[PDB]
Amino acid sequence: VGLVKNLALMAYISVGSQPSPILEFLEEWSMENLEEISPAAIADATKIFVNGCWVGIHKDPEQLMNTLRKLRRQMDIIVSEVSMIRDIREREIRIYTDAGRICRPLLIVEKQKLLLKKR
């Protein structure tokens, strides 16, 4: 009891993707790579983790996360299975693309109104 489990009707498991397009898209932006960066610049910054690999450093999480979300919504560079974490208490953006991440589809609510209109 409690060990055997069953998926939900809507539960879906990510099949898996590749991290290269995400790395390229994040490298084009104003993101200093971790290999060449002043250690004193890590405090007032947010650490980006992709598939558990610490790479790069950014100085504007509030815009980077929004850009990533819009890009994923448009389904052009990042597949719908990828998930981007925003940790607010500690500045860390941990992105994962490996398989096995159970997920489900949810509607989007911008301010107080959904996008699933009559159209």
């Binding site: 498991i13 099949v15 898996g16 971790l34 290999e35 250690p39 004193a40 890590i42 405090a43 650490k47 598939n51 558990g52 690999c53 610490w54 790479v55 208490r89 500690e90 490996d98 398989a99 096995g100 991440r101 159970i102």
Partner: protein, 170 residues
């Protein structure tokens, strides 16, 4: 539990623990190493002789001495290690297959410190910087957890679990 991507080798585990109890002496359990090694010797073995560099890789801000009083004991503990060679010898002496001579021990220590531990960040010829930064992030997270500024990570939280479907199983 580190694992690069479905590699031939199995996933490797890195336990960076701390003694309860001087007190507050941080240790590590590297793969193929039966005994424990303090984190500072590991940092010096990765190619960081200077203490300031080690602290910067571990601790990101020096304006909080309260975090810093915690690392001073362990940092004073392993002080008879400055150069890279002695650190490599010390780490290789605890290997499962200790080389009968010194050169074999150095080679074994370098191989275990560049292929066994943290293979996901990189197993190329020049990747010690990213490994050191990842280890420093680990120690920083451990120190934050010890101070209580960040709650512990729940073991049963599915956000930290992965499902192996027919693909990976086959």
């Amino acid at each position: 539990r580190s694992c690069l991507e479905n590699s031939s080798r199995p996933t490797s585990t890195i336990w960076v623990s701390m003694l309860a109890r001087i007190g507050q002496r941080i240790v590590a359990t590297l793969p193929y190493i039966k005994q424990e090694v303090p984190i500072i010797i590991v940092f010096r073995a990765l190619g960081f002789v200077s203490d300031r560099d080690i602290l910067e890789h571990i601790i990101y801000d020096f304006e909080d001495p309260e975090m810093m009083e915690m690392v001073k004991p362990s940092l004073d503990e392993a002080f008879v290690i400055q150069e890279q060679n002695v650190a490599l010898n010390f780490i290789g002496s605890r290997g499962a297959k200790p080389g009968v001579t010194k050169e074999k021990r150095i080679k074994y220590a370098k191989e275990v410190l560049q292929k066994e531990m943290l293979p996901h960040v990189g197993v190329s010829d020049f990747c010690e910087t990213k490994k050191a930064y990842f280890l420093g992030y680990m120690v920083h997270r451990l120190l934050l957890a010890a101070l209580g500024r960040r709650e512990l990570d729940d073991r049963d939280h599915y956000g930290n679990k992965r499902l192996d479907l027919a693909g990976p199983l086959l």
